[PDB]
From a paper:
At the heart of the spliceosome is pre-mRNA processing factor 8 (Prp8), a large (approximately 270 kDa) and highly conserved protein. The intein is also found at a highly conserved site at the center of Prp8 and thus is at the core of the spliceosome.
The Cne Prp8 intein was solved to 1.75 Å resolution. The Cne Prp8 intein structure represents only the second known fungal nuclear intein structure. As with all solved intein structures so far, the Cne Prp8 intein has the canonical horseshoe shape, created by pseudo–2-fold symmetry that positions the catalytic N- and C termini in close proximity. Highlighting the splicing blocks (A, B, F, and G), we see the active core that carries out autocatalytic protein splicing. This catalytic center contains the residues essential for splicing: the nucleophilic cysteine (C1) in Block A, and the terminal asparagine (N171) in Block G. The C1 and N171 are also positioned in the vicinity of the conserved Block B TxxH residues (T62 and H65), which are important for priming the intein for self-excision at its amino terminus. For example, Blocks A and B are far apart in sequence but fold proximally in 3D space to execute protein splicing. The unstructured regions in the Cne Prp8 intein structure are where the Sce Vma1 intein encodes a linker domain (dashed red lines). A closer look at the active centers of the Cne Prp8 intein and the Sce Vma1 intein demonstrates unmistakable overlap of the catalytic residues, further confirming the similarities. The Cne Prp8 intein only has 2 cysteines: C1 in Block A, and C61 in Block B, immediately preceding the TxxH motif (blue arrowheads).
Residue numbers in the entry: 1 to 73, 90 to 120, 133 to 171
The structure:
């Protein structure tokens, strides 16, 4: 699940804040097709902040949120990993994993991932099909 205020893409290309996503809403998938959201849930807790080397907005999300990544050795394979499991990996293993944006340097290198010191509100939902959808800057996100 994602920090409130995270900007996502509707299926029509306009932006919607994650907490404004409602049941049945259509989001944009990484291949360009529609995704249906359901099971809207909300809570409040200390989230993890992920910062990239590249100048993109931080991703802030719950400890059980699933990151969709590319892992080295094309050149990279698709892997899903929870924030908890990724956080606990040794940094030499972590550097093999990259976030990514949907094509049309699309890999993003994580510079830091840290637990925040105060709780903040988050919103989550499930997405059909491959469970992938787009942030406003085309970062690929998972359920």
């Amino acid at each position: 699940c994602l920090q409130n205020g995270t900007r996502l893409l509707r299926a029509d290309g306009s932006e919607v804040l994650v907490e404004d996503v409602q049941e049945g809403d259509q989001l944009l998938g990484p291949d360009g097709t529609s995704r249906t959201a359901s099971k809207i849930v909300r809570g409040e807790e200390r989230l993890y902040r992920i910062k990239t080397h590249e100048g993109l907005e931080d991703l802030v999300c719950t400890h059980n949120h699933i990151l969709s990544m590319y892992k080295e050795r094309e050149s990279h394979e698709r892997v899903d990993v929870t924030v908890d499991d990724f956080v606990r990996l040794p940094q030499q293993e972590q550097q093999k994993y990259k976030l990514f944006r949907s094509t049309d340097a699309t890999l993003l290198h994580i510079n830091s991932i840290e637990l925040e010191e105060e709780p903040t509100k988050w919103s989550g939902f499930v997405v059909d099909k491959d469970s992938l959808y787009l942030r406003y800057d085309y970062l690929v996100l998972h359920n």
